[PDB]
Protein: putative maleate isomerase
Amino acid sequence: QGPAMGIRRIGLVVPSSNVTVETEMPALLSRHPGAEFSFHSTRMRMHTVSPEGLAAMNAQRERCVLEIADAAPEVILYACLVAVMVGGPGEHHRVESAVAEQLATGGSQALVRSSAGALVEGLRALDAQRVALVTPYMRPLAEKVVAYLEAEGFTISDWRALEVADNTEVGCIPGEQVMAAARSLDLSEVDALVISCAVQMPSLPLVETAEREFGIPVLSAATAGAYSILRSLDLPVAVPGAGRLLRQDSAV
Structure:
């Protein structure tokens, strides 16, 4: 198509209290052998992962979009997965389209992705039908994630909810806790494990060790987001250290 772009600019629309995605996204993508990235954030305030915390956070969408658009990123990621999925089946399409339209009214060419939509995208690239989930959420929010994915055609075999409503606390969840949850799952005939549905719960270093342990593909909201960003930018998905999903273009 056109001239090689140089540094690829990624926009991140993130909960104010989130520290994990701005850490994990650069760490994961820094291992791309053929592309360089920069990361630019806008904050929507949230510290409590509850219906009301998420509603208050989502209401800042229009503000955040105008802010990050000013940076002319190539793709913009709506980072919080449950923020979208709490709105019920189909919500990522409504949110993504609302962002695209707002960007278009301001003359921006930026692409739009969301963690929720990216998870679907990653699960489908994996040819996954039966899926198991680990989440830091309170149970009712976990159940909405489950219902969302069922509507997209997935069978959710089993899931865990750590019930950690405070987002700062979510960021401090140790890998041992996450691994203990993943190990409590029944994984028989599960095609893929979502080791973290939330972008605040750390999981990146567990992805490789968990694939070796469980013998299935392992992804998170963050690795799904990375996959989606790569696909949106027409870049090869061949990044080491981030599970099978990030090596889909290995043979290429």
Notes: Residues 1-252 form a domain with the Rossmann fold fold (CATH 3.40.50.12500). DSSP finds eleven helices and eight strands in the chain.
